[PDB]
Amino acid sequence: AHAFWSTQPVPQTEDETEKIVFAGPMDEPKTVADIPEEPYPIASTFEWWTPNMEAADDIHAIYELLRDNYVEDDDSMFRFNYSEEFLQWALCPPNYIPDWHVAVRRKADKKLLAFIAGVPVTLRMGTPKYMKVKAQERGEGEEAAKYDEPRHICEINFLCVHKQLREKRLAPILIKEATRRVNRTNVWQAVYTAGVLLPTPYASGQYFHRSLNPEKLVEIRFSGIPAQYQKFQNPMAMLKRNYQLPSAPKNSGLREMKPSDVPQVRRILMNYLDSFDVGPVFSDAEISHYLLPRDGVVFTYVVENDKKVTDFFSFYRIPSTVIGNSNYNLLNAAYVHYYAATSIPLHQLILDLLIVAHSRGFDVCNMVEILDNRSFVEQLKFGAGDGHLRYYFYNWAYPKIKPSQVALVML
Numbered sequence: 513a514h515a516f517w518s519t520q521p522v523p524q525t526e527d528e529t530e531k532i533v534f535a536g537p538m539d540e541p542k543t544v545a546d547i548p549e550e551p552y553p554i555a556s557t558f559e560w561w562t563p564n565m566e567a568a569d570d571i572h573a574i575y576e577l578l579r580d581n582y583v584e585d586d587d588s589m590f591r592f593n594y595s596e597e598f599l600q601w602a603l604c605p606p607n608y609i610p611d612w613h614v615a616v617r618r619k620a621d622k623k624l625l626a627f628i629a630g631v632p633v634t635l636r637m638g639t640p641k642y643m644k645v646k647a648q649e650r651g652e653g654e655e656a657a658k659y660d661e662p663r664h665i666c667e668i669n670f671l672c673v674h675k676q677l678r679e680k681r682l683a684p685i686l687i688k689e690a691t692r693r694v695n696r697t698n699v700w701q702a703v704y705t706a707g708v709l710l711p712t713p714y715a716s717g718q719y720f721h722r723s724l725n726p727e728k729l730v731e732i733r734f735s736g737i738p739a740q741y742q743k744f745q746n747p748m749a750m751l752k753r754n755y756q757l758p759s760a761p762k763n764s765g766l767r768e769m770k771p772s773d774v775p776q777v778r779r780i781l782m783n784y785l786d787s788f789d790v791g792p793v794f795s796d797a798e799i800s801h802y803l804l805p806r807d808g809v810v811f812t813y814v815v816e817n818d819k820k821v822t823d824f825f826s827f828y829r830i831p832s833t834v835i836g837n838s839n840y841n842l843l844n845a846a847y848v849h850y851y852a853a854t855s856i857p858l859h860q861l862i863l864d865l866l867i868v869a870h871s872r873g874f875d876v877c878n879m880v881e882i883l884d885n886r887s888f889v890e891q892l893k894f895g896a897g898d899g900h901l902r903y904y905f906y907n908w909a910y911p912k913i914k915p916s917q918v919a920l921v922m923l
């Protein structure tokens with residue numbers, strides 16, 4: 513029973529989603545004038561707050577909320593510790609809408625108690641290729657193509673309720689108020705991800721992890737000894753030896769991305785992402801924002817061949833707090849971001865990502881099996897994680913697809 517989600521324009525069961533064969537909206541069309549102009553009522557001791565993401569004080573307040581209260585593993589050993597610089601990056605892409613960043617604070621002391629953030633994204637989200645095949649074989653190509661134009665929608669992230677206020681139905685009102693503010697902008701769909709099962713994902717991908725410092729990872733109980741290494745008398749030693757990375761990048765033309773690479777990176781990324789059912793459309797401004805290197809936040813490298821950029825990869829940094837370990841209190845994790853390989857095998861491109869991440873002191877490289885990420889798991893010695901990242905739409909019926917048809921990276 514979902515007292516909240518059963519009232520919302522989402523598919524309500526896996527059985528329902530299994531039957532969806534076209535993309536399209538779920539709610540009746542509405543207009544902005546149908547949407548209340550007043551923020552939803554909230555307890556008189558709390559207030560809605562829209563942070564100013566240019567104010568160091570406001571960014572710091574969000575930072576501290578998430579540091580102490582955002583996603584935790586089930587054993588409370590690790591918690592994400594997004595940096596202030598990362599939050600300003602993730603929350604403030606080009607043309608972002610300040611009113612889509614929704615917070616609740618306590619009036620008396622102005623303490624931040626809850627947060628949810630929406631940013632604009634332009635998403636291809638029309639009927640998937642294989643369902644269009646089946647639709648065309650039914651003479652319904654027209655209906656299957658109705659919504660192929662990229663849509664300007666909302667990407668939701670960073671939903672967080674302070675630990676002391678959990679299970680008091682604050683998340684539904686936060687979500688409802690964000691929806692109100694987005695709808696008041698004439699935007700009617702959103703996309704979000706979660707590591708938990710909600711009604712009802714259109715895609716789910718397993719997490720995979722590449723140890724860069726396997727001794728540390730075993731000590732902090734992030735990962736175990738892979739089953740294939742349990743046959744050894746000293747598995748950690750063999751792990752270190754087989755996981756040892758080349759001292760140097762295998763691609764001699766590798767260098768950090770620079771502003772003049774933006775147009776070529778845009779073109780090769782968009783050409784690659786076009787082959788996926790669900791994916792973002794990025795302008796030069798958005799390519800610049802999301803991919804140009806930013807210290808401690810995002811790292812992007814290009815390969816030149818024949819004087820031109822032919823390949824690139826990116827990763828971003830999310831440290832996690834390690835709780836209860838007497839030897840370590842932080843885990844430095846690199847997350848595979850966007851990439852495109854036009855002249856070298858993808859596993860050779862991503863090997864250079866691992867080499868660079870190791871040289872920069874990261875402990876582990878994490879990814880979800882979206883894009884073509886599954887294809888280099890075995891080759892580059894990634895191990896399967898316990899987690900799955902689920903992909904969801906708000907007010908968009910969508911057929912179930914494999915994660916290999918998803919090209920939207922979530923931060």
Ligand SMILES: CCCCCCCCCCCCCC(=O)SCCNC(=O)CCNC(=O)[C@H](O)C(C)(C)COP(=O)(O)OP(=O)(O)OC[C@H]1O[C@@H](n2cnc3c(N)ncnc32)[C@H](O)[C@@H]1OP(=O)(O)O
Pocket residue numbers: 513514515516517518581582583584666668669670671672673674677678679680681682683684687690691694695699700701702704705706707708710906907
């Ligand atoms: C058109 C524009 C639309 C824009 C909006 C689109 C939708 C966006 C949707 C949000 C996308 C977020 C994407 C991310 O950021 S996913 C990461 C979410 N954050 C965390 O896990 C951080 C740590 N946990 C917390 O802060 C709290 O436990 C949260 C805030 C998660 C729940 O707070 P609390 O534990 O105090 O519970 P409650 O009593 O207030 O509320 C219980 C209700 O909340 C439903 N619930 C539980 N977990 C989630 C979840 N992860 N997404 C959506 N709904 C969730 C649950 O099914 C129940 O509804 P129902 O089962 O009774 O019906």
